[PDB]
Design a protein around this ligand. Structure first.
Ligand code: HEM
Length: 214
C-alpha cells in the first residue's frame, strides 16, 4: 500500500502466522511453556536487544532512522538484564546460553546497523511494535503457566514503563515510520528485511524447540 506502516503489516501477515504456527510457539500458546523454555526465550531476547539497541544508538542521528528513535519509551536491554538476574541468578552473564541461531540473528542486526542502516527500521518495527502489540497476550500466558514466586521480578520485559498508552504510541510510531523518505528500491528492501526478521525469529524458535526435546 501507500503508507510504509501499512505496507509492512500486509507484507508480513504470512510470516507472522508462520511464527504463530511454529511448534515452539504453538506450545507456548497452548500454555505448555516450561521454565527451561521460557529462560531460553529471555536469554535470546537479551542478545537480540543488546545488538539492536547498540545499532540504534550508532544510527540515531541518521536521517534513515532518527524519525523512529524513541530510546526512553522503547529500550529493553535494562529490563532484560533485570529479568535474567532473576531467571539465571547473580552470575547470569557467565551462564546464559548464546546459541548459533541467536548468533545468526545478532549477526544480521550488526550487518544492518553497520552497512545497511536504512534497513534498521525493519528490525525496530518487527521487535518493538511486535512486543508492544503482542506483549499483553504473550505475558498473560507465561505468568499463569510459570507459577513463579511473588518476588516482584522476572517479567519486566513485558512492561514498557515509559509508554502511558500503547494505542497512542503505536499510532505515533507508525506516523514516524511513514515520515521516512526512501527510494522505492530501499522501501522494497525494508519490506524484505522485515520478512527476514520474522524468519530469523522462526529459525530461532525451531532451534530452541530442538534444544528442549532431549
Ligand atoms: C506466539 C506468537 C505470537 C503471537 C500470539 C502474537 C500476537 C500478536 C498480536 C495480538 C498482535 C496484534 C495484532 C492486531 O490486533 O493488530 C501482534 C502484532 C505484531 N506482531 Fe505478533 N505475535 C506472535 C509472534 C510474533 C513474532 C515472532 C514477531 C516478530 C519478532 C511478531 C511481530 C509482530 C508485529 C511486528 C506486529 C505488528 C503488526 C502491525 O504492524 O500492526 N509477533 N502480534
Amino acid at each position: 500500500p501507500q503508507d510504509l506502516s501499512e505496507a509492512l503489516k500486509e507484507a508480513t501477515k504470512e510470516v507472522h502466522t508462520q511464527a504463530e504456527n511454529a511448534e515452539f510457539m504453538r506450545n507456548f500458546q497452548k500454555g505448555q511453556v516450561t521454565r527451561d523454555g521460557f529462560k531460553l526465550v529471555m536469554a535470546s531476547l537479551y542478545h537480540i536487544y543488546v545488538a539492536l539497541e547498540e545499532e540504534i544508538e550508532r544510527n540515531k542521528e541518521s536521517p534513515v532512522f532518527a524519525p523512529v528513535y524513541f530510546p526512553e519509551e522503547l529500550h529493553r536491554k535494562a529490563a532484560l538484564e533485570q529479568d535474567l538476574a532473576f531467571w539465571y541468578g547473580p552470575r547470569w552473564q557467565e551462564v546464559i546460553p548464546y546459541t548459533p541461531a541467536m548468533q545468526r540473528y545478532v549477526k544480521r542486526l550488526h550487518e544492518v546497523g553497520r552497512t545497511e542502516p536504512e534497513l534498521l527500521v525493519a528490525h525496530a518495527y518487527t521487535r518493538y511494535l511486535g512486543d508492544l502489540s503482542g506483549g499483553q497476550v504473550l505475558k498473560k500466558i507465561a505468568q499463569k503457566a510459570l507459577d513463579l514466586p511473588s518476588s516482584g521480578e522476572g517479567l519486566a520485559f513485558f512492561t514498557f514503563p515509559n509508554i502511558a498508552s500503547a494505542t497512542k504510541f503505536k499510532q505515533l510510531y507508525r506516523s514516524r515510520m511513514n515520515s521516512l523518505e526512501m527510494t522505492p528500491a530501499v522501501r522494497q528492501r525494508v519490506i524484505e528485511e522485515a520478512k527476514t526478521a520474522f524468519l530469523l525469529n522462526i529459525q530461532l524458535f525451531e532451534e530452541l524447540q530442538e534444544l528442549l526435546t532431549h
